Design a protein around this ligand. Structure first.
Ligand code: CYC
Ligand code: CYC
Ligand code: CYC
Ligand code: CYC
Ligand code: CYC
Ligand code: CYC
Ligand code: CYC
Ligand code: CYC
Ligand code: CYC
Ligand code: TE4
Ligand code: TE4
Ligand code: TE4
Lengths: 162, 172, 172, 162, 172, 162
């Protein structure tokens, strides 16, 4: 997985050499920024159920056909509502992992790789997940650097869906 | 490779779980103590050539069979390969210390190494001893109380010893 | 690869024999029924995306463990690889149907596949079930009585089932 | 083995794709032509012993030294006569296989690959086999498309010996 | 590869020893008899095509199963591969004779060859017989008393037989 | 290992062919020169202990600090004196092997590959071994072609240390 720390190590390994002073200061910078990032991840984690619940309802309100139109890809059944809440929770979980890891790597590996193919094969509209992500941004209540970082990962997910 | 943060994330994802308070607390403590980790990597790296050469001298004093004609470190080509391997292993250990996770050492150094030595006829147990001698010297250097703000780095030194021991166990 | 004609030739050559009347008759019957073979390949190929996606949905409904966090089809990268494998296997099956011989499927798809999955930790038995679900759907489509000159394609459908079953047996 | 059908499949496989409509019509054409080809192969098969016998005698008449000159490469002994009849039967068998398979593939793989090296190492004259092949062409009694196809494979063998 | 001189050097180095008088004497005798070695290599090399072709004819007369349809030397592609292998092995044997050491033959020809044949289904025991037939013919040619200064080459012929037998034993 | 004989064989093997007449005459030349070379090697071997002993003393006289300065890399202790005599014997042994093999190969493989790294890591001065080699050249007592060959290998070692 790519993180600021694994990137420093990979650079040294590529050149067959021990780590440089610049590489160590890069990791020091990561350590100093990690404090605020992990606090953001814990705040999102503590509020995850409310954010997931609210985001799902926001999608259903924006796109009412998703709760009536027939088909297993829609949320017209309890099983479909459960799939949708599950997926929204996955996206929020990935945001928290990016905050912990210091970059997009977790979302890249566990969600974005293959995303277009999954949404196509299973007939899932990217617009649904974009609306869920906008709701999360509007309601997570983060401020300062925590908001910059969380919204960076949310906007990155929106870009991947766009 | 994983660092300590990516490792917790990977463990959480396989369970479909947000991080627990214990995981958050463990990572916050790692960061709180990060200056000590940086000193350890800096100190070991800056003394890497001495750590290797002294450990090699100590190995051959203890195991002269390696440098008798016919021994696995006899000839300058074999001796140089042996010194190179010691430096390689030390290098990947320093990466593991920086990352706070052994994956880089496992994936890019130790995996397949026992089998490589078995096919060459290199005594893996002697490589393990060489690693142990580098371990002791690296910890004494990383944990030197002079020229550094006083504080307790015993937890880090145990972690460092763990990576060296993991390398030794993978070749013994 | 061999088609049905080259397969009989290869069997004859290994015995140093001209074709027997039975071999000539078998190949003449294949040609006499060739339009049905072409319809089957055309129909399965034209519906390939639906056959894969429906079979995948059915697999995961039956085996939800595959899509629980930690399961082998969890994460979009693993799900996409799984969907890709289903499409690959269907593709080589359609080639075998056109050829009237399984060699292309054996040589370019199935050989080594069990061992590949074993090393990944992919459950080969679940891949076998996915193949079986594609089989049933592919035969229903190939054997649909609507929009085609009526006639009996039961022998061909048994041959088609055989190729799917051969694929399933090679990974189970 | 290359046949018109395996060539269509190989093209699709090379591009990682399902078979095209043009590829299916190519196989339809093969199926429609296969009728006359297989009939030619059966006629040759039914008459194989007479054709082999006559071809061997044609070679011995054209090249009388082959039945008197000393050496295991010649047909001066019963063992050499048997080797020669065997080889002529191989060539005829290959012609029938090409007719069945719809192309030169069987002859390419089982006879032509290595042919020059075998004839050189074992001191076998290509001219002997060319004469046998000319006799077969003159006496197989095929007509129409059957004759075009059979003689195509015979002339292909002659070219390989030339 | 090693020649006879490098082989003695390698044996001495592994023991950390200067050459013994016996080693010096053995190498001096090799040189004293070197003209015979050169005649043997020259004579076998100049007749290589005949040695291969005659040995092949003799093999197939003794083992007609190899040239029956379905046999491992049936088809011109398999026959040509078989003739090629015989020539390859003879070629590496002539290199071993020139060098006075089997290493080139072991390293560049025989190592892995049994396993290659096992995977192909080629009968290694028949390859061994082919090698033996080349051996007998090669020695008769190398040891022909006509057109050469008379002298005793029996020691060399035993060495030559040894290399052929080593090749046969490695595939049987 | 490279020798004049293995080089001839390698050339033939590279081209997939049997040995040429020029290659055989190259080996004949090697055989004819090998007589004098092996005699040189035996003379050095018979005198090895005196040459090693004298060379070590020559180094200690040229560089007196090597017998007093503290450190395991020096010959200030009995163990260090023994290491030094051992190493000098290695160099002489390699010279004899080159004479036997007809080229630099033994010295290339067993001593020169890795030499710079060993002398650096273990803090051994190349100048020490150059002086030992000069003593051996001055005292081996070889003449004629034996001296040309032995001194070629000695000068080759000096170049590797330079
Ligand atoms: C155990 C290893 C020993 C120990 C370490 C120790 N260090 C500090 C404090 C600091 N260490 C650094 C080092 C770096 N910061 C960087 O960005 C880099 C890469 C360029 C390095 C090498 C710094 C900047 C500090 C803070 C300033 C200072 O010097 O104190 C402590 C104090 C507590 C803390 O974690 O900050 C300690 C205990 N001290 C020992 O006695 C052990 C032998
Ligand atoms: C079993 C599969 C079903 C079945 C098939 C069936 N088809 C025919 C006749 C034809 N099928 C084709 C199709 C093609 N010819 C080509 O060259 C290509 C590739 C471009 C295709 C797809 C054609 C041309 C015919 C002949 C004309 C016609 O439409 O009949 C039959 C009739 C007997 C025969 O073999 O020709 C049958 C039975 N019919 C069923 O009921 C099964 C469900
Ligand atoms: C056993 C192999 C038979 C045998 C050999 C034999 N040869 C000689 C002498 C010579 N052989 C050569 C050949 C070469 N010298 C080269 O440089 C090359 C490569 C171009 C070759 C092929 C030469 C030059 C000689 C010396 C001149 C001569 O012809 O005598 C002997 C004599 C003793 C010796 O070793 O020189 C012998 C015995 N003789 C037999 O009867 C065996 C059948
Ligand atoms: C909610 C916004 C809308 C909704 C959701 C819905 N999703 C599915 C099925 C799937 N969702 C995924 C998503 C992921 N799987 C992963 O591993 C990851 C990364 C960790 C993600 C983002 C996948 C792969 C599927 C298909 C496989 C599965 O079922 O798990 C469905 C069911 C689809 C079906 O046809 O059965 C639904 C309903 N649909 C709506 O209408 C909501 C607005
Ligand atoms: C020194 C303590 C011991 C010793 C070592 C020795 N090793 C070799 C050869 C090899 N060592 C490796 C190890 C690695 N190569 C890499 O790239 C990495 C990182 C992934 C590692 C860990 C390999 C691959 C080889 C073989 C290829 C090569 O030489 O480069 C030798 C040479 C053996 C020989 O006979 O040539 C030796 C001598 N020998 C001892 O006696 C010590 C116990
Ligand atoms: C889907 C039903 C199941 C599933 C599948 C799955 N497969 C992989 C990875 C691979 N699949 C193959 C198969 C092929 N590659 C080819 O080129 C061909 C034709 C010759 C075949 C048949 C290979 C080679 C791999 C590994 C390399 C690659 O990924 O491209 C995965 C990924 C596993 C991982 O951990 O990365 C998966 C998930 N998984 C299930 O749960 C279903 C039962
Ligand atoms: C007949 C026209 C003349 C004749 C024939 C003759 N042939 C041989 C020996 C061989 N013939 C082949 C031919 C093939 N083997 C294959 O596998 C194939 C493709 C399927 C072919 C075409 C081969 C390989 C041999 C050598 C091995 C063997 O004996 O089977 C001989 C005997 C040669 C010998 O020296 O023993 C003969 C006599 N010779 C004439 O004079 C006829 C005019
Ligand atoms: C002849 C006496 C027997 C025989 C031989 C036969 N061999 C093959 C195929 C191969 N032979 C080799 C051997 C080598 N290749 C090299 O480069 C070297 C030097 C390092 C050697 C010794 C190899 C590698 C192969 C496989 C690859 C290739 O064909 O080039 C065949 C072909 C088998 C097939 O089915 O294709 C045959 C027939 N067969 C007999 O019956 C004789 C006993
Ligand atoms: C003598 C001129 C001076 C001297 C020698 C000295 N050498 C060492 C240690 C080593 N010498 C070698 C040399 C070789 N090893 C090989 O395999 C080969 C090729 C066959 C050579 C040339 C090596 C590898 C070492 C280190 C490993 C070992 O101890 O064997 C020492 C001891 C170094 C130490 O720190 O322990 C000494 C003293 N030193 C002088 O002052 C003499 C003038
Ligand atoms: C080729 C391997 C031979 C190495 N020679 C020796 C091996 C072992 C010992 C030896 O006594 O070691 C015991 C203690 N632990 C650290 C190993 C001493 C010499
Ligand atoms: C990782 C593999 C776990 C897949 N989970 C399941 C496996 C098997 C079953 C199951 O009950 O299957 C029985 C019938 N045949 C078709 C398999 C249900 C779930
Ligand atoms: C595929 C291998 C079949 C070869 N056929 C034969 C094998 C062996 C014999 C045979 O009788 O050999 C006995 C003597 N030694 C040299 C083998 C005769 C024929």
């Amino acid at each position: 997985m790519k993180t600021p720390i694994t990137e420093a190590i990979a650079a040294a390994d590529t050149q067959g050499r021990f780590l440089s002073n610049t590489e160590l200061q890069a990791v020091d910078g990561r350590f100093k920024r990690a404090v605020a990032s992990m606090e953001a991840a814990r705040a999102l984690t503590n509020n995850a159920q409310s954010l997931i619940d609210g985001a799902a309802q926001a999608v259903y309100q924006k796109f009412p056909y998703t709760t009536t139109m027939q088909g297993s890809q829609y949320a017209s059944t309890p099983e479909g509502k459960a799939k949708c809440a599950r997926d929204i929770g996955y996206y929020l979980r990935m945001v928290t992992y990016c905050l912990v890891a210091g970059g997009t790597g977790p979302m890249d590996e566990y969600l974005i790789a293959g995303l277009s193919e999954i949404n196509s094969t299973f007939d899932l509209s990217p617009s649904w997940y974009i609306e869920a992500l906008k709701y999360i941004k509007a309601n997570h209540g983060l401020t300062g650097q925590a908001a910059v970082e969380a919204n960076a990962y949310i906007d990155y997910a929106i870009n991947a869906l766009s | 490779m994983l660092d300590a943060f990516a490792k917790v994330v990977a463990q959480a994802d396989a369970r479909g779980e947000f991080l627990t308070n214990a995981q958050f607390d463990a990572l916050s403590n790692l960061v709180k103590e990060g200056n000590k980790r940086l000193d350890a990597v800096n100190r070991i790296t800056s003394n890497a050539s001495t750590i290797v050469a002294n450990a090699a001298r100590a190995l051959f004093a203890e195991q002269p069979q390696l440098i008798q004609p016919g021994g696995n470190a006899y000839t300058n080509r074999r001796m140089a390969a042996c010194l190179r391997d010691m430096e390689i292993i030390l290098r990947y250990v320093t990466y593991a210390i920086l990352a706070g996770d052994s994956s880089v050492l496992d994936d890019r150094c130790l995996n397949g190494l026992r089998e490589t030595y078995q096919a060459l006829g290199t005594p893996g147990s002697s490589v393990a001893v060489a690693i142990q001698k580098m371990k002791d010297a690296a910890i004494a250097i990383a944990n030197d109380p002079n020229g550094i703000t006083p504080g307790d780095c015993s937890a880090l030194m145990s972690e460092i010893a763990g990576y060296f021991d993991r390398a030794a166990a993978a070749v013994a």
